[PDB]
Design a protein that fits this description.
Chain A contains no helices and no strands. The first copy, chain A, is mostly loops and 33 residues long. Chain B: This is Spike protein S1.
Amino acid sequence: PQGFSALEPLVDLPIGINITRFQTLLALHAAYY
Amino acid sequence: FELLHAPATVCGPKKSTNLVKNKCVNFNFNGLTGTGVLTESNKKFLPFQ
């Protein structure tokens, strides 16, 4: 919706890996943006 | 001893002295360092600040 709201941090990780991809792990038994 | 890219998760023990108020102090807060007078206040902080 055309409103406003801010976003707060949750989880900082020092994992430090080299990411160049992205995916989603969803159940299979109304969508995303 | 192994040190490759991120040596910021296995450190030695950290000390923490007592605190005083209403008097000039040379403080060191979480790495933030300065001189001033630490007096309790009222300003409100959001849990991540």
